[model samples]
Target: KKYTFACLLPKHLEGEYWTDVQKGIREAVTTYSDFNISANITHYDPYDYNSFVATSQAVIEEQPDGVMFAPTVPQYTKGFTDALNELGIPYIYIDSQIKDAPPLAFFGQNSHQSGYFAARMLMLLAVNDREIVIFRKIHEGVIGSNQQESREIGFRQYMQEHHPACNILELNLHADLEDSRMLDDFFREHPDVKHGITFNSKVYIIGEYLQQRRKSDFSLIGYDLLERNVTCLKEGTVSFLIAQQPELQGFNSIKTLCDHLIFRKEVACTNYMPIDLLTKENIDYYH
Candidate 1:
């Protein structure tokens, strides 16, 4: 019972975050050597949607035993899953989810619930009339990401239902791949605001940049346990972090795929990994 899998991920393939994911998946393969992998490699061109589509198609064309990928988003590799179904290729979704088409399983966070949990933490720390900032990194598809949008909406819904008086400042910190002087000027203008929230890993940049200015006035609740984010949490700059156990996402997706295609083992239709909240006290355990 041997098989192969194709995992298509972000174009920027140089971070320890992704490397850790690769490690988890490789470990699973090692444990179940009978279920082999043709390749568990990543490839993409961030700026080129066409290339993304082409790459996904190429992976499907190889007709691997199963496909594992973070469905490319609203445009999600243009019928990639459909192609798999037509050819009877079983696939699994990891780190992200999709609608309309079913997959073998979805092994990641319940995105909206994670956001609701983040809002609960923010509200707990607030004393009086308070304001929270949700700093978004804007681009055409950036905010449109279902996962990011789901988290943001969950935060808003929580405040609307329970804490109606709290004000929020949604800042689209468009750094354009460069930390322009204007970005600093923007924060300077809004010195009164505190309790910053970020939708993604850019939470580190927000924490470090603010620390450089000696502006430790705000508490930050952001996503991901990136190394810098972890450092800031220890240094008392970042208040809390929401980790979705991405390493497990990578590891389990490969496991479920192998189980289905090779051993004929039935996998869960949707497997959502829990979200881990990290603060100064327990952050080390998570790291």
Candidate 2:
């Protein structure tokens, strides 16, 4: 029996962490070609609520044997999963996940744990600055990504439990296309604060801002292995990056469903990827 699978991602599978994940997906699809598993990956701009809903409806129409997607928000994810349930279609999650409307399984890091470990590393990297900044780069519609929020929550909990006296400051930055006016303002105002971390993947955004200003006095950490972020790591502008095996997430998402569909294997409800800490010193072997 031929099985059809469809994957709906928030954005194009072209940049940063996505490309590696897609490579894994493509590799798995090819590996299972003899097993008669075929997949289609569709992406749309998740910035608009109406359009995202529309895309979900269209995806549902595809009538896939199994589906894979990243949950954007509870409202939309619950609604989308409700429709999938109506059709009796099983689904899996990649990258970020939601606890609602239980799926066949999930293939991603535990954001909370990752955040906690990230904070632990940040503490080691920082010079014990009493105040540290939790930086966020807000994009439209991603105003409150659940993954980022969850990671930040973990970071805060870790700080509270271990570094109770530490003061946490948050800065929401929306940098211009080229200029770093807001970034400049942040650094200028908080001259004493020497440590910062972002739960999101684009820590390089800050890395570039600091590099252009010829400043490396701040210790910074972020998630994922984006080239820009890695470059900053090489230059020692960014102290460390936490990777959650984006490629394996994609690989396992497909393999899990394929095993269930093709071999009747029992699928685990959760596939928590490992949280890996990387730095310029040991990055030579990690791609």
Candidate 3:
């Protein structure tokens, strides 16, 4: 039996992680097309709460056999998940997971754990710079993505436990990734702050910013293995990267649905992505 599924993703958060997931999802559809597996990819403005909520509204209206999505803001998504249940449909989560809202299977990295790992990596890279900046980029006047927030929280709690003296400065900028002067101004204001970590995937934004200034001394940890991010890791602007297989997340989410629906198998509820740590010395393997 062929199954047509719906995929919900954010349009604004542009990066390899998101793009790769789409690639994976597409590949799954192509591979499983013989079995009649198809999917509709839906993009919503994750920067706007209303956009997320309304995307949910629209997806419910245009219900498919199942859904594979990334729930950015949970408040707006709860109703959509409930609707899935009412419609007797299954949904798999990619990239981010909403714990309370049930998904047949979650295929993505654990945000909190990734954040804690970032903390440890930052610490190792720090061989204090007592003040470390948690650089965050907000888009279109929005600080959405609970998954990234959880990573920040995870980093904070770990720092609280281990690096008690380290001052955690948050440079939450509501600006375009290209306009990285916010980072420059941040560094200017707090010159003592050196080590930086970002939960966002646009590490290359910071990487290029620091590269232009030749601030090689600053140690930074960013997520993903995007080409620019890999370049940064090699050039030494980014000290470390936490890489995950985004395409795999997409592929498995769809493939899992195939297994459940077509093959009649009992699927696991959670699939935590394995975190890959990248440094200049070991970046070649990942790149």
Candidate 4:
């Protein structure tokens, strides 16, 4: 008997992060020739909440043996999880988690720990009394997941405990054209922001915005090795890039699901990967 699985990721099939995840899933499926198993991947635009709901509903109708979900928004995922539960389908969560959703297993970076490290890394680059900005995307209808919230909490808590003198400022935007002007105005008003850390992969927004205006005094830190971020790192726009090993997350989640289905293996509730830090000096080693 053969088993089929569906991989539902937050981002479309573009960029290094999601592309590597897809590669990992395919490699895991091909690893075992003995098992008759397969997987299909589906995705919506990163910012498209309606498309996520529609895609989730469409994928659920196919009724694969299992599901691997890398969720984004909280409210949207809550409804999708309910539909999966009603269908009694087992799921393995990867990358980010949907709060209170029961899953067979989860494999991803520890969001809180990563944020703690990010803060510590940024602190190392700061001099005298300085203001640090934590940048992220915030919108009217879109709700963030535990991952993003946890990262911010961890960063803020760590800074409060260790670097109490440092002023931590949080900047949120929709990451759209209109929001760009808002970001520009905020930067103009707060010229004292000498350091920044973004908890998500969209660090390029800050990088490009700063570069366009030729503002290079501030040190920025963010996640993922996207081309834009990498270019910024090479140009000294970004200080550190945190990598979550998306490929490994994808590979292990699929493999774990297959093990449980085929060999009847028991999986641990959480599988956390390392939060790797990449700097300009050693960034090349990662690729």
lDDT for each residue of candidate 4 in 1-287, tens digit (9 for 90 to 100) = 57889999865437745787888899998996578788888886556678778998888899888899777667777887788778887788888775477688888888888888888888888856468888878655443445767888888888988999888787787744465787788888897778888877778888888888888888789888888888898888898899988888888888888888778898887888889989889987785
Roughly what TM-score does model 4 have, to 2 decimal places? 0.87
Off by over 4 Å in 4: 44-53, 72-88, 143-145, 178-180
Better of 3 and 4 by TM-score: 3
TM for every model, in the order presented, reads 0.91, 0.93, 0.94, 0.87
User: How would the candidate models be sorted by TM-score, starting from the highest?
Assistant: 3, 2, 1, 4
Across residues 47-66, which tens digit of lDDT does each residue of candidate 2 receive? 55655677778889989999
TM-score of 1: 0.91
What value does the lDDT take at residue 196 in candidate 2?
A: 94
Superposition error at 206 for model 4 (Å):
1.5
All candidates: CA RMSD in angstroms?
Answer: 2.2, 1.9, 1.9, 2.6
lDDT per model vs. reference: 0.74, 0.82, 0.83, 0.80
Query: For model 3, which pairs clash?
Result: 2-36
Off by over 4 Å in 3: 13-15, 175-178
Scanning candidate 1 in windows of ten residues, the lowest lDDT window is 174-183
Residue 147 of candidate 3: its Cα lDDT? 75
Cα miss at 150, model 4 (Å)? 1.8
